[PDB]
Amino acid sequence: GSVTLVSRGTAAVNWSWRRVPAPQHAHAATELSQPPCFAASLQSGVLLPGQSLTVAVTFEAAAAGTYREAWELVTRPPLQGSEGPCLTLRLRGAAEVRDESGTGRGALEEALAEKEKRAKVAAALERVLRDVRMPRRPQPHESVEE
Amino acid sequence: PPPRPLLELIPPRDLTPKPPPTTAVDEFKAKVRVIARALAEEYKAVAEGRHKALIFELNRSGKYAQMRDSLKTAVVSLVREKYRKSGSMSPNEMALLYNDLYGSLLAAVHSSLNDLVDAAAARPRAPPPAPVPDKQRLGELLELAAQAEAMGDTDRAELLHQRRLLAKNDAQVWYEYGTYCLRRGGAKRGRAEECFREALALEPAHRGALLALLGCSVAAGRNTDPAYLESAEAAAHRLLDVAGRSSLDAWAALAVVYRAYGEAKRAELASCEQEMARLEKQQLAAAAAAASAISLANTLLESLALPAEAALALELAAGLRHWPSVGPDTRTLHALAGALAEQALARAAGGGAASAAAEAMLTPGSSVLSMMRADAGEAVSSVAAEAAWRCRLLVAQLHKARGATDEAIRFYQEYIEAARSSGRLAEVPLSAWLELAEAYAARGQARFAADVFLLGASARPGCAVLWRGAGRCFVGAEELGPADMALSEANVLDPEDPEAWGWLALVALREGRAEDAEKALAFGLRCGLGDPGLLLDIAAEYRAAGQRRAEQRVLQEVAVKLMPESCSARLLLARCLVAQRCGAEAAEAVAAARQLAAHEDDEAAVAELEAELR
Amino acid sequence: AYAARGQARFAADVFLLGASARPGCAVLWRGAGRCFVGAEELGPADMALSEANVLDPEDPEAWGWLALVALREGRAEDAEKALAFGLRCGLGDPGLLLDIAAEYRAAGQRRAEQRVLQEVAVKLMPESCSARLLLARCLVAQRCGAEAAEAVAAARQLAAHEDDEAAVAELEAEL
Questions:
Q1: How far is CA B504 from CA B86, B304, B523, C99, in A?
Q2: Interface list for chain B against chain C, based on CB atoms closer than 8 Å
């Protein structure tokens, strides 16, 4: 991610931060916060007046989830007077599995094979029905032949 | 081209295996475990104020300094152990590598401390992440397919079934795919029956060879009009099933197959007589064994219940041979079970042929469903209790009495509350929660459906379909917080579900996280995203918040999914706002032209005027 | 000369002749493995190439040929490790990577298909590699973000047949 933050106010402050997890429902049976998805090395830095600091955030994923881990807690010993003592920062990390369905097609043409087999079964019906044809024709003949 | 005087195996056999060195990681884990136990002791000694006090006291006492020294030595060893690739060594990559080693350190610490974390009295929530190449996802794939079927996500369920089929191609997975194909519909039953055939050919499974017989019995009665020859092989197939167990209840089950077979009443009667003899022998043996230390109707009940588990509604044949058990047996609760079976058959018939619920409701108006086993336990067996439970569920399902969604809510609430009081919440099918939520959504209230989905999730935390439905209902009720919240929980619980990603993208758009919405939409687009309504709402939110290229992409996906739904008008409006796509403007004027509605053609004329302007 | 001739097995023969004469020379073993791959003698190819990179590491050609043998054997994990080691090395041969990407196309594991394909694109941009890149992206998923860039590359490539393919790919991207 590499989020950048800029100071102003002619005051130097110690940039520390805390990680508050997403507040999952009472019934949620997931622990997606104890192993930190997002990690940074510039933690607990120092910010001088009129300076910009860039912090590189690396997102580690163990499954294909949104992994909402709202850092949202930057503390500074002279607590900020800019709309709340602690600033907010919303972190979202999305992973994907890249499902492989190339062979999924392979199962399909079976169903065509059974379409063929269904045709065979229906042809059996034609066999049975045409069985009725053969006895019908000869009956009148012998009478007029005699 | 002269050949070798020697062979090809002449190169020396060095035979050098490749072992991975990982000792430093284990040393770090052990040292961290010891340090963490000491830290826990200090934590017990002396809330967030407690944590601040503990860090301050550690700094003051200097135990933190010894921590730093020992951990510094350990981390130096770890870095030398793992990170020694080196290379170009640019500063941005250096920051990235520092982040990598820091994340590895925290991962190692968490892995080491997971023992104590689990041992803690707090409820152990296992992390959902199970990244697996289908080596173990089997079984869980069946569960996901079951949830998809419960919600009606047919294509996703079929894809999961085909995935497990490719993974294992075993008899039982073939059987599961065939059963799901049965549940899909009457047309799919041919595929279902031959998947049964594939499983049978692979293995003559005991549970197998009965489903194929059921499909054969379904033939010659199906709406697709199969002939008698299709059901002809059923007798032989179920005779082989009987040979699977020659002197068991499966034989009485196959007696139903003879009964279905025409002009075989003599063989059916002989089979019934010998089945009665075998049942009497078994009962006498049981009585003698108990002393030293009916059944036919129950068998017909179970052999009716299995096709009730299947999608077939033709176990009415099993019912028809049920009660004709010569002489009315002791009614007990078997009669009530038979009445439950015939009610289930009636509801299945109504499902098979639409508009049948109007006459279905005629019987439960009076003297049907045991009045829910006299509406009380009183002096009755647990069979009667579960019969009353199921009767309540069926009555509530019987919407079409007069459409009284209110009494539908009342009886769904009664059913789920009885389940909760008995403690068997998980036993409630997901179809019940889906029906209750749909009934609430039918009325003006959506938050009620949201909370009933939440109740379902509480009952079944493992399932993610309930959470995703909760997210849908929260979106409908416009509670963005809980919407994104439960949708994220559902997505993490079950990935590979495009609906969850699409809903997440919608909520992100509404909250204003444009980049999050783009990512979620892209992931869902890589996945299925069959539902057109989600994409249409995404396009509407985009119309509200710019991003005309995203508008165009989403609406093009809508157009590809569905030809004539006048989404071409939105296509044309978006590319007129873009104002460079006159060719597609004319194309979509033609799209409306063969869409052919009066209002659609008036809008087409307006769009044509706009295109002429552009 | 024998590779120009039909039976590249003869070129494999003289390559092991150089190898038998001087076991130390890894180049002879590497070429012999190349010719077994050409002749589809996968077993001897694997053995010769394994002995070659044992004799001499830091040979990205040998690593890539090993990866090709692994892919045609179906040991995808071993192929992935081989490509990782080759990328630690140079891997300057474009044809080997193209064949690797083809074997991925035939075997699945599409993410590796792109890894190899952007590797090829970096190695040689004007070789119509972006056409195959767009094909891979489209078949994997709806990734119009990269599909547009691939279509632009195909358009700027400016060959007649490549432009027909580019038009087809652009129609797919619109889909």
A1: 40, 43, 10, 39
A2: 1-4, 6, 8, 10-11, 14, 85, 522, 525-526, 553, 556-557, 560
Cα torsion B77, B82, B85, B89: sign: negative
Contact A21, B452 (CB under 8 A): no
Write out chain B residues lying below 8 Å of A97, CB-based.
131, 495-496
Region label for B122, one of left (φ > 0), alpha (ψ between -120 and 50) or beta (otherwise): beta
Residues 6+ apart with CB under 8 A from B155: B528, B530
Phi, psi of A33 (to 5 degrees): -120, -30
* Residues facing C136 on adjacent strands: none
Q: Please list the alpha-helical segments (H only) found in B375-497.
A: 382-397, 405-422, 430-442, 447-459, 465-477, 480-493
What is the separation of C-alpha B485 from the centre of its chain, rounded to a whole number of angstroms? 20
- Characterize the bridge pairing of strands A13-17 and A74-75: antiparallel
Q: Nearest-CA residue of chain C relative to B561? A: C175
Using alpha carbons only, what angle is made at residue C70 by residues C12 and C46, rounded to the nearest 5 degrees? Answer: 35
Chain B environment of C141 (Cβ under 8 Å): 525-526
B72: left (phi over 0), alpha (psi -120 to 50) or beta: alpha
Measure the CA–CA gap between C45 and C37, rounded to whole angstroms.
6
What's the CA angle centered on B560, arms B555 and B564, to 5 degrees?
Answer: 85
Identify the burial level of A95 via C-beta atoms within 10 angstroms of its C-beta, where 0-12 means exposed, 13-18 middle and 19 or more buried.
buried
Is the separation of the CB atoms in A24 and B454 below 8 Å? no
DSSP B21: P
The DSSP 8-state label assigned to residue B399 in this structure reads: G
User: Which string of DSSP letters, residue by residue, matches C18-53?
Assistant: HHHH-TT-HHHHHHHHHHHHHHT-HHHHHHHHHHHH
Return the number of other C-beta atoms located less than 10 Å from residue A14's C-beta.
12
Three-class DSSP category at B326: coil
Which 3 state secondary structure label does DSSP give A74?
strand
Burial group, residue B294, by CB count within 10 angstroms (0-12, 13-18, 19+): middle
Instruction: List Cα–Cα distances, A28 to A73, B481, B495, B502, C54, in angstroms.
Output: 23, 15, 16, 21, 53
3 state DSSP class of A14: strand
How many angstroms away from the CA of A56 is the closest CA of chain B? 7
Cβ pair A102:C108 closer than 8 A: yes
Nearest to A89 by CA among A78, A113, A73: A73
Experimental method: cryo-EM
Residue A68, CB-side half-sphere exposure with 13 Å CA sphere:
20
Structure tokens at B516: 């999050």
Other Cβ atoms closer than 10 A to B6: 10
Strand stretches in C54-97, DSSP E: none
What gap in Å lies between CA B363 and CA B343, rounded to an integer?
9
Sheet containing strand A74-75, strands side by side: A45-47, A13-17, A74-75
C144 Cα to chain B: minimum distance (Å): 8
Residue with tokens 């219940």: B305
Give the whole-angstrom CA distance, residue B426 versus residue B466: 12
Q: How far is CA B462 from CA A28, B467, B483, in A?
A: 9, 10, 19
At residue B324, what is the residue type?
P
Nearest to A96 among B484, B504, B523 (CB): B523
In whole angstroms, what is the distance from residue C36 CA to residue C12 CA?
6
Rounded Cα distance, B396 and B400, in Å: 10
Counting Cα atoms < 13 Å in the Cβ hemisphere of B487 gives 24
- Residue C105, chain A, CB below 8 Å: the answer is no
